[PDB]
């Protein structure tokens, strides 16, 4: 039962919580009770789904005291603890690949113009892959394992944990229009809980905790 600040979340950790590139997040004039777990809206993992993605600073611009500080303060610097729970019975099957892409430049298909502020900055709602196979990046899903990756296998491994440090080429950056990380949950193998489709949902639960958070300018 994990708990940061006031909020708590019940976990099912059974293996070492791997830190992204083995660096535990830390903060180093700038600087405090907003370091708490935010559980995003549950997402339906249908058999015909493609894949979801949340931009963490974008995802937390409007959520509680963290959102209030980001709207008030001109800068930020924050690590992210991402907990993903695919909730299903022993009967269900499939594989979720959780990839924390650094600087995931969204790429439209068969257009000249780039993605606008609307298509990129979903916020708390999160986005959906048009082409999961190409990560909407020109890359391959086969090559997506270079990034901090984990597997939710509906057999054995029913939850994933990612610990993202401050990945940016500046000590601090802006949350309003920059996205250091992109947490992408992609179904590698389609959900096949063949119970006559009594409940095809098998919803995914995302929980983001901004750790070692500091800001500049009150």
């Amino acid at each position: 039962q994990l708990k940061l600040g006031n909020s708590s979340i019940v976990t099912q950790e059974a293996a070492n919580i791997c830190c992204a590139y083995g660096e535990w997040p830390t903060y180093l004039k700038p600087t405090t009770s907003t370091d708490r777990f935010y559980t995003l809206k549950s997402k339906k993992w249908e058999s015909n789904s493609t894949g979801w993605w949340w931009k963490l600073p974008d995802a937390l611009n409007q959520i509680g005291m963290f959102g209030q500080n980001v709207q008030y303060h001109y800068l930020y610097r924050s690590g992210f603890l991402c907990h993903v729970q695919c909730n299903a019975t022993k009967f269900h099957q499939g594989t979720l690949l959780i990839v924390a892409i650094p600087e995931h430049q969204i790429g439209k298909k068969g257009t000249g113009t780039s993605a606008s502020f609307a298509e990129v900055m979903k916020g708390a709602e999160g986005g959906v892959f048009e082409q999961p196979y190409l990560l909407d990046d020109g890359t391959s899903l086969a090559c997506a394992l270079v990034y901090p990756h984990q597997w939710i296998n509906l057999r054995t491994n029913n939850s994933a944990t990612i610990v993202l440090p401050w990945m940016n080429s500046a000590p601090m950056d802006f949350a309003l229009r920059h996205n250091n990380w992109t947490l992408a949950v992609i179904p590698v193998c389609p959900l096949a809980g063949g119970t006559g489709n009594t409940n095809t949902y098998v919803p995914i639960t995302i929980s983001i905790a901004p750790m070692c958070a500091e800001y500049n300018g009150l």
């Binding site: 650094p102 430049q105 969204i106 780039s114 020109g138 086969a142 990034y147 920059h178 996205n179």
Partner: protein, 221 residues
Amino acid sequence: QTRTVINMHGTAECLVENFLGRSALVCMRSFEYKNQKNFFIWTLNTRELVQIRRKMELFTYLRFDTEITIVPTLRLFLPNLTLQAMYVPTGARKPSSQDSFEWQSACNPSVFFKINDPPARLTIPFMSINSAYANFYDGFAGFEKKATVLYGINPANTMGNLCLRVVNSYQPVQYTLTVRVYMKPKHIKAWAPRAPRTMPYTNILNNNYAGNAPTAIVSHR
């Protein structure tokens, strides 16, 4: 169908420094001269040539010092013309024309050479505001919620511009001068390697893929 018995070697060849860090022909612009314009302007970016663009886009962040080597070439329809290569950093007005006041500056570094001389070199140090070049940027240059501000362009990532002027532009002969630019990174430090790209390119300002098909990379068996 093969005869390969490869003995074990060292890791010298597979260094990032030896991979990214060597000269590559990025710019091959030509200019006619006949009976005011046709000066050389070039934005410093690794995205112009597809091969080096993919090789650089293998990594997220990387620092280097850039050796820019300019090779002149004269193509008459050889006189030893004087060439001036001026490296204008970001935030300085670009030369409006060949006969522009910006050339006669006391702040913009430049080199004077001639055709018969060895090709010119400059080493521009790690120039960006940001503590490392970002090949990809999941943000916006400005704060305006308008199409005027382009997506995925860090304005700190600009390395400045290089402007070459043929001082002896007005000559008795009609010809073409072709400038070759060679870019060589030095002391390369790389962080957060990216997934190698598969599909072709559209433009330097954007990462759109058109399409080895977009639904299948490998030629199906």
